[PDB]
Symmetry: D3
Subunit: 291 residues, 6 copies
Amino acid sequence: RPIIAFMSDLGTTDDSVAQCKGLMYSICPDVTVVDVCHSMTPWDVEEGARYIVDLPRFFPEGTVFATTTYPATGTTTRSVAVRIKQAAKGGARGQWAGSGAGFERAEGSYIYIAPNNGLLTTVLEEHGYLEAYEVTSPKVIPEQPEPTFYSREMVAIPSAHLAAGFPLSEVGRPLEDHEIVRFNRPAVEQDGEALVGVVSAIDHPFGNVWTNIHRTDLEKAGIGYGARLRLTLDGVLPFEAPLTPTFADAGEIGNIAIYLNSRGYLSIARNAASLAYPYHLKEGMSARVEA
Amino acid sequence: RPIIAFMSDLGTTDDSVAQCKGLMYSICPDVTVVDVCHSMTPWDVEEGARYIVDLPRFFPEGTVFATTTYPATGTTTRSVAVRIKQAAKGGARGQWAGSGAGFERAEGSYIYIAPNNGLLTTVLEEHGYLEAYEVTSPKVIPEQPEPTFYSREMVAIPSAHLAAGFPLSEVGRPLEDHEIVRFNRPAVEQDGEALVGVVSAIDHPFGNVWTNIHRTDLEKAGIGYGARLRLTLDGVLPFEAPLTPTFADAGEIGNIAIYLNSRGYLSIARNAASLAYPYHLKEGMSARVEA
Amino acid sequence: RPIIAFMSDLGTTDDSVAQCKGLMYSICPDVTVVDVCHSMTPWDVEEGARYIVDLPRFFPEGTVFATTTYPATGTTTRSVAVRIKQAAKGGARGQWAGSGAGFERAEGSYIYIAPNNGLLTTVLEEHGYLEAYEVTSPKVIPEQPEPTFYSREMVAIPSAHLAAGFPLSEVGRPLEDHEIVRFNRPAVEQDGEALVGVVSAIDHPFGNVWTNIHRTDLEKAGIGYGARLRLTLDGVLPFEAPLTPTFADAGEIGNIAIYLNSRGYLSIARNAASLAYPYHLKEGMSARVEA
Amino acid sequence: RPIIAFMSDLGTTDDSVAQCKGLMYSICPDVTVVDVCHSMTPWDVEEGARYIVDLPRFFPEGTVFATTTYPATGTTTRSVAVRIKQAAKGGARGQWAGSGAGFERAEGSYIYIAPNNGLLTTVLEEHGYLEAYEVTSPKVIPEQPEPTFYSREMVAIPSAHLAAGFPLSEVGRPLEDHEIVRFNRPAVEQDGEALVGVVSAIDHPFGNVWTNIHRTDLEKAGIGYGARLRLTLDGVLPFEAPLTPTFADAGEIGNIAIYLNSRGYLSIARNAASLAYPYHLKEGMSARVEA
Amino acid sequence: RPIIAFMSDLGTTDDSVAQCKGLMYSICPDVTVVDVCHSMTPWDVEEGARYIVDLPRFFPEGTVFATTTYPATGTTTRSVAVRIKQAAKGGARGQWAGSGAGFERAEGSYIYIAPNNGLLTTVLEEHGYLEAYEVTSPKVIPEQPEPTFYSREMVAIPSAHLAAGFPLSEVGRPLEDHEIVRFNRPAVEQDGEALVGVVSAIDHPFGNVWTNIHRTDLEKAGIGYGARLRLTLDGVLPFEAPLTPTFADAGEIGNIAIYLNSRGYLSIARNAASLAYPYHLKEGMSARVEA
Amino acid sequence: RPIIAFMSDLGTTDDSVAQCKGLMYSICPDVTVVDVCHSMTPWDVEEGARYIVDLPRFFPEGTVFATTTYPATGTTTRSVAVRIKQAAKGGARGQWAGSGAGFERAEGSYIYIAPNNGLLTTVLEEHGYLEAYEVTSPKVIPEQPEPTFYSREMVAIPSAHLAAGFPLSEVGRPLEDHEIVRFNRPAVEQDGEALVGVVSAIDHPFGNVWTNIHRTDLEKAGIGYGARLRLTLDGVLPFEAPLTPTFADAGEIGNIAIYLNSRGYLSIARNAASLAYPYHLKEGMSARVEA
Ligand SMILES: Nc1ncnc2c1ncn2[C@H]1C[C@H](O)[C@@H](CO)O1
Ligand SMILES: Nc1ncnc2c1ncn2[C@H]1C[C@H](O)[C@@H](CO)O1
Ligand SMILES: Nc1ncnc2c1ncn2[C@H]1C[C@H](O)[C@@H](CO)O1
Ligand SMILES: Nc1ncnc2c1ncn2[C@H]1C[C@H](O)[C@@H](CO)O1
Ligand SMILES: Nc1ncnc2c1ncn2[C@H]1C[C@H](O)[C@@H](CO)O1
Ligand SMILES: Nc1ncnc2c1ncn2[C@H]1C[C@H](O)[C@@H](CO)O1
Ligand code: MET
Ligand code: MET
Ligand code: MET
Ligand code: MET
Ligand SMILES: [Cl-]
Ligand SMILES: [Cl-]
């Protein structure tokens, strides 16, 4: 039972995704293709990264992540295929996913295949890796790749060979670390007792607000649950709430909750109401926090 | 081949759903996860109800409906898991789904697992139930549920245990009826020969308009096909048309059809054109019909 | 493990699709359903055709394409079921899809099932057909089809019987060619050295612009890679770029690329930026190319 | 203290209008300039005509109407200057305007000055004219008119000379009737008892709906106050109300009133609420009335 | 030199206003018509009131305010004409308007003429009045008023007779106080040290935010300039700033200023930036303040 | 008959402007107040400059230009009052405004009064100045200026004193040149034969596009009428057209005209259609022209 978990920016409006899916079933008859999502902001590798980094602990070992936004499509660049190290505990407290105590996932048990454009930055940082390869072998990519559709040609297709048991180290030469392109994570700065970060995303469809201010960033300025926090978005909209586990802790429908999202990050929202949408709060706006 | 049919408000923009799907495949290797939809109006239990109520007759016996919007996530609340009684004929005339005479579905053959927040109201109304359970066992929910992601923790995960043959009655104690939270259906009033109801939905992507005025509500005011109806949306926009089986019965492209939707309810549309969109007609307006 | 590739206009907002999916699994237990996409512009047969015509080469032989937009739902019209001839090479160069030299696909290896409203126009013209049939048998459609939901009753349901091995020629009587409804493809005109066509689509979610000016139309005005082209949308926005394989060939981010899309068509876009969205360029504007 | 009543499409966003105003005061020191409005849809002569045709009765005799939208600016075309015949009674009943029995206005008492593009169509047809002239004299237009600003140069400037007592017949040679450009008024058709017309305008800022169905058109289908009318916009929105003098006659706030607007035309609206705005009703939709 | 100051909801899109203006110059040849504004929210008497209440001290004595929104147009209701008592000091500090020490304005020196619908509520409250009259005399209103245009017929027209020296007390019988319709001012409540009020308007075109929390409301909870204030709009967006005279006091471009607007009311804004528009802050949203 | 020509960003939605106008009539009974416009982009000094610079040649000698956006309101800053030198020919060829040969305007005949924030930059550039003064005297500004309404207090009021014959040099001390705040004009660069500039404005309500590429900038690259120009907005949308006097020169409705606007600058539009609006072209984009 092989599984390819598919993430791209191909959208949900035409047959793009299906074409990849057609190819995946054609290469690996028994595959289950799990859509991650296909609707990220085109070419936004940083956004992409957020969608792919938290996956491994949820999927059965041997799962293959075909993760792609490919602005460099049709160029000589080639995909990188890495087998990640730890599945890594994640979440508001840092645990294994699943029922009971969660499902402990053995190391070396997932492979990502992605453009070598930085998409895998956070994956590599949070999970580490055992081995990394340039996807150049004509046994796993087309001999005449479609100039514009490298998401299909240099990702989908070879994700399928990988799902189908094609040995990882045969896709092309090993890549040294400096050859795996990285992007720079926007850093969280401890100026004063405060923590400056950014709204790193809007949590659709609810309009919850997500900052890049991680738990660890918080537990080092003191801040843990119960703590009365002042959170300031866009530099002008301040907000006050205690840090709480969840939304209903805010009290009435509409009230502000400051909480840690399911990825471990300081977030803000309204209890059973959208905070972002009425106020057009958006990704890229700054975000300060202090108790 | 166990099937989990998945309905949520998780959206289609991040890895939320896939996280759930990963866990599903991990708990129940053989599962086929069928998306119902994941783009309901967040926290709108009434809306969600409408997407899950008519499913059972279309799915193979033994299907599990993982259905969730969970405003109460992170609280002490626990999901309910019911096995429904009748699959229940549905539709504009009330029939079994499928080719020929349709496929009759044995009683007691589907289980719903949902927040105990009322999402299951109309399900229980239309289908009745054999047994209902508080989803509390550590064998089918996390010991450390992610505060904010109870859709994953108290729904996805346990739906997978259930698909996997985990005995329903072992998820937690039996729930008495009064403990199964219900919402109140907004009622249709026979004031005069008229029927006041409500636009209960816009039928996306077509812009057809659906009222909570069910057939039985109509065949007790007399009205059946052929009948010349006056329908009045928002209290201001009147409409005249015979009740007809379908859209093309309206005649020319753009003409008004008053008809009965595939769920059995009084609806209005334009023949091969959108009624709702040019006029900004919404889920929530007043609907009124007369002869 | 046969496969139904499903394309419709039913949207991703309600349980419509899943109802069809439910029936599919019910009729053909072992089916894998592949979503093509379900968010075509309602009733736009020409658009739908675009989404279905290039699929055969991608899917394993025996794949069944349930392709539907059905404004004539509820009428006496009956769907057509064709087995296509050639899987037909496609793309910017005209190749088999897949790794290596691609996967050659035997003829007579795919069935399309659709409303007889013209959706399969391009299919039939680019792939040809071996045999065509009116879908009338009670063995594959309901005895009381839901008047408004012929996508489900006259497509999904029977697509499932055909996936399940139901002999194609037993769905209903053979249709003669003139009975397969055709729409008229907007033609490309060689007025001068120029080539007048149309923006056939906006390529979502990137905002690339696609014309109905096919490569063949190009290679007979001389035009091939390297050529400096003037492309003029809407009649007033001219555009100058050499015809190149891909986006990055435009140079800096934002630069215009004139290139052939993955379907073989002349297209225009910006390198890692949206061309269509900032300027509200929309399908249907004139499009012209010349040396 | 003579008066130039000024109507144009120059907008209220730049100094365009004021430039004309500046010239007006410069040419006719004692002028009072009355803004009619300057935010007509650019180049829409039919709309402009609506704004200028009913003014004469309101202004003191000798008033000069500088009325302009000039797409032909910078060309050899020259404005027409007419002295109108009748000030012409107007309104829902047909009366002189003002207190008491209103202010009867002598004939031959107002001059219009406009592009010879058809703007004065309705003017000439409802008021008649005594004398018409091509505005060609260097005594009233520039010797080097600004190519793009013929509203200023071929209207405002000369309107000022005429306000200042410049003899009308010395602006340029007389024009014969056939040389005064006319546009064709969309006609109201008595098909049955019904009356087919058009939504001629949206009455901003209220959202009332105005048809080109004049009272006279009404009083010959029988229709006068008290009559129960069916009015049908866009072909599908029917509407039922008695024809009444005013809005409050509809009863409660929000209720539909069918009434005659202040220009004599059949109109529809909501009592102290907008009819057109919530439903995006727009000028140009069909409009029909009957008993 | 008589002046009529004109305020209505007639908009700036057609000849409505001009028709009134035509009539005004016709009744009172020497009048100067000063537009106040014509773009208030139709029928919003409370909004209207805010536009008319602060005027008297700016205009030369004898000025006449023609102030109208007239939902009751065409009914038997009649306008009220009042001569107000004091011109009343206004502003952030409460002073006479003008150069030097300002222009002291004698009592009994302004008349308002308005629908008797409550438009004059705040005028009457802030300025008091000497005498009040029903405008019924056929010497100052038409004998056949246009049903729909009472703004013109029962306001403009008789504002002009009043400007023209027609004795106030001749317009119709005196009205006792209980006959002058009043609306209820939304009250500011001292719950705790805090002051609950409302955003009473958005200050266009800047997007400054205006509350109904008057200076006096502030100087009674202590609050005066310098004071560190917490201001909470919509119940969720808190804000902190010192109360300062003006915008630049906020410091950097973009910073929040809490200040008293030119009408005396607690306001909030961004220094040289819009506060309302990016966040879609709107009239009707609550507004708390506390130091 | 003294004229105050008024330009501000006060908008047209409240009584702001009228407050100013009231004071104007109160200080200078005989004044005619001419609105320039009041809807400029708040605080956008560059924009405002463009609305006030070309006025003088259109107004009678002695006219006073009250021109204001005042971000610094409430601060110690004080307005500047200058008497300009030349009225300065303007336009697409450079002429006096008016009928015949136009009306020559004597030097030293207009005064501008404005915030000393740079609003007057291009005025002083194009017109030069004879004398400049700090507006400080209590005789022409309030002793207690309203902190927030310096447009009224330090502009409207004193413009009225000036219209009223109050000696310019008595408003406050003479200002040396370096004390008259200037902004920097964004410059046009002759890189190659090309001219890079900027869309300096959208010409509302037509959607014509105005560049800061002045005629003289063009007649030194050679370019005069007849010349075939390539113009490139936003760096992406190219355009080809002869330089022509006017719009109709483009030929058919909708065709592109490249021409020189009434202020002398290079502009682009569609003949009797909007260029800017369908394409969302904005004040601020890059403009580039070549041959
Ligand atoms: N106009 C474009 N500029 C830059 N990159 C683009 C463009 N269009 C598509 N892409 C990329 C992203 C897809 O994942 C990928 C599919 O191979 O193609
Ligand atoms: N702002 C919110 N307030 C209250 N509850 C919220 C909020 N956002 C998401 N949720 C809930 C509902 C999801 O279905 C559910 C999935 O765990 O999470
Ligand atoms: N308003 C309408 N007029 C005509 N046809 C409509 C309408 N809405 C849906 N449809 C059709 C097309 C879907 O594919 C189809 C699903 O069976 O339903
Ligand atoms: N793009 C354009 N095409 C054709 N005509 C236009 C355009 N813009 C303005 N106008 C005209 C009409 C104004 O009344 C007039 C003012 O003289 O300028
Ligand atoms: N549809 C309407 N419902 C209620 N009131 C309306 C409507 N249209 C106009 N008005 C009012 C307000 C104007 O000031 C006034 C002009 O006399 O007419
Ligand atoms: N938010 C603001 N920040 C800074 N200044 C502002 C603001 N709003 C108005 N103004 C100024 C500019 C007006 O022209 C001027 C009229 O007094 O008031
Ligand atoms: C708490 S909402 C559950 C889905 C959400 N997007 C998340 O990952 O946390
Ligand atoms: C153009 S890159 C992404 C694939 C594209 N939507 C296609 O159909 O080719
Ligand atoms: C309809 S009430 C306001 C006047 C309206 N705009 C008219 O033209 O009559
Ligand atoms: C401070 S902005 C000046 C105009 C504003 N609308 C007011 O009355 O205060
Ligand atoms: Cl991040
Ligand atoms: Cl108020």
